[PDB]
């Protein structure tokens, strides 16, 4: 009913003359000041300098200059660097750390003409499926202010779902792009590993970006905005999709995991997307002899994630992992990556839940081991849900989180579409085709 | 002169010759010329003739592939199902691979026929090609000098005209140095742009995840570009450079930690001068050129760790995983320093190595080795600085024929371009050849 312009639609209106870049900037500033009160998503604001960049974009528009995102207002996850703006990752010690240079993703998007109004909220250390920190506060889900907006790119997904900005960009090392888009019912693409540069996504007061597991990708409300943002930010132009329809598509449907569980409403929602593809000409399978050991994957992924997040350091007394043992873990990862290369020889995509349930209620327990989730009235471990996102992060494959529907309480349910490595554009295309199939 | 890889595929698809005829003609050139050279040390001629007969059947079905029926060889470190992969070790001579490597799969899918594999040093750890399993490869321009390493057999087979295409690996110049010694074309690719799946250490599934790259080797720049398009993880950005006019070239004939021949210095200077006459701008210094003396030191400390798999001699303390993560951040800092350098320059022109092909050496320790630079003795291991920038920075580096020294040994030029501009390095190289032939 209530609808906002997409990133491509905004650029088309500015290039045509329906509106100016300053009008689009001021319209988004209005939506932020009007709607971010109960949501607390756009926690870093640079509206004055954003209006100056929109006035410069209209000068280029008047100089007949045309760029794919010229004048389009947007925000980015607070973990990305913007010159003049702070980068804190939620740490109070790092709230006065002001970046001196823009991040690569910001440079790429600015070079396409985008205007950055500010940065979206995050949890402390980007280490939660929530968005809460002592510098900015807590971000609330626009669909139910009592539930989490997700994390670590929760402020990004909440700003999108509330219609404040049409485009965003987040990071993902343990679902931190797919889970926020799942909780807020927006579009988020976990990209292929090493496909987009993490330069500028630095830990505060360093130049260190994660060299393992972590990926940065676009977040939006339309698959076309995701595809344009991917082409603007990738290290090289990635292969465009040649999938024209769902006929002939090979889909592996997974509604269960050896180490975690999913809602009945979640299972029926993912099963409904697969059925919409079968009626559109696709073939869907529920088992494969080439599906890797997901129980070993999640175990090997968790052991690597904790080492990457700890920078190889160990608790006092505990012996650290050796460099030789780390090299052995990378060979274990590459062994799993090829196991998925063989799986993706018989299947075009994996359809599975993003997470086992919808957005959970706000939690003040920092320890994931002291948390639990309600799966159809039952008590389930919280951290075990990392298995739903382990395949794409540990295998490196692109994974799309796209809106599928909502549960009985109105909380969005998203679908995870996993395709083979470097087929990010196929994950976007299959997702757009799933949306068409579900709207018929 | 021999046919190139593209010319061979064009003659097979046109009907000038068949794929079995091209296979048998390359088998003939190998058996006729590899006697004093010893480059094609693993031979699969029987199964190669069966694959050429299958290519001719596809050719007769109007099927057309870019390398359909083209006979070639690959460096012995690459896996081919049914063929051994030993890396020169006697302990690994009976290690037969069960599946083809990724590069071999890509090239076979483009229609290439693999006649065999080219010689290597033990452990791929020398600028020579000699091992107890196959013997020594000799430079086709002077059988007393090294053919290069670690992909020396590949460059020697190309220089002798046996096969039109080859593929090697490079962690310390092992693609550029062999092509430099034999006067052929070799592309050190951008890091992580081509998969090393199948380039496994014998009897493992472990491929180097740092510094090392695999790239094409040929005698024409156009053959390099086709093989790159066939083997890269994704189609890489094609070059839009049409001529040398307007090109920004940083000419480097000196290094803070090593030296170059006077004939080498004049050869690289002659390539740079040919570009100025074609409209290019050439500079001899840049305030944005990183500290090459620190680069080689940080690269050498990382190279030794990668080659040792993090292990340390007894008594010596190993490098910690935390310290390793810091070394990767030190590497990325240097990579961004080159991103700024390549904002003012399109390419770096510098020597591949400080001198031409050296005489066969039996000293395993590089610290006990030396090189003859214009009558003087210069350290051997210090020459790693000529190849350190591209490997440690990740940039693509092309080794292309420039000429020969006074003794007839080839001198090649190293063309370094920015990361992911592999096709620009090939294009600038092809344009350097045109300018020097005028």
Numbering used by the authors:
A (entry chain A): 15 to 454
B (entry chain B): 17 to 454
Sentences from the paper on this structure:
Here, the ligand‐free crystal structure of UMG‐SP2, a metagenome‐derived urethanase with depolymerization activities, at 2.59 Å resolution, as well as its (co‐)structures bound to a suicide hydrolase inhibitor and a short‐chain carbamate substrate at 2.16 and 2.40 Å resolutions, respectively, is reported. UMG‐SP2 belongs to the amidase signature protein superfamily (AS family), which is characterized by a highly conserved GGSS(S/G)GS motif and can be found in bacteria, archaea, and eukaryotes. SP2 shares the domain architecture of amidases, with an α/β‐fold containing 12 prominent α‐helices, 12 β‐strands, and five larger loops. Structural analysis and molecular dynamics simulations reveal that the flexible loop L3 consisting of residues 219–226 is crucial for regulating the hydrolytic activity of UMG‐SP2.
The crystal structures of wild‐type (WT) UMG‐SP2 (GenBank Accession No. OP972510) were solved in a substrate‐free state (SP2, also used as an interchangeable designation for WT UMG‐SP2 for simplification, 2.59 Å resolution) and a complex with the phenylmethylsulfonyl moiety of the suicide inhibitor PMSF covalently bound to the active site serine 190 (SP2PMS, 2.16 Å resolution). The structures of SP2S190A and SP2 were solved by MR based on the refined structure of SP2PMS omitting the covalently modified S190. Due to the hydrophobic nature of the entire active site cavity, two glycerol molecules from the cryoprotectant solution were found bound to the active site in the substrate‐free structure, one of which contacted the backbone of the oxyanion hole residues (left inset). In the ligand‐free structure, A141 is in the vicinity of a glycerol molecule. In SP2 and SP2PMS, K224 (part of L3 at the perimeter of the secondary active site cavity) interacts with several water molecules and H215 (as well as S222 in the SP2 structure). These interactions consolidate K224 pointing toward the substrate binding cavity and blocking the secondary active site sterically (right insets). The surface of SP2 is largely negatively charged, but positive charge overweighs the substrate‐free structure in the primary and secondary active site cavities, in contrast to the BBC‐bound SP2S190A. This charge difference is also the result of the aforementioned structural switch that distinguishes SP2 from the substrate‐bound complex structure of SP2S190A. Due to the steric blockage of the active site when empty or partially occupied by PMS, substrate accessibility (in particular for larger molecules) is limited, in contrast to the complex structures with one or two BBC molecules bound.
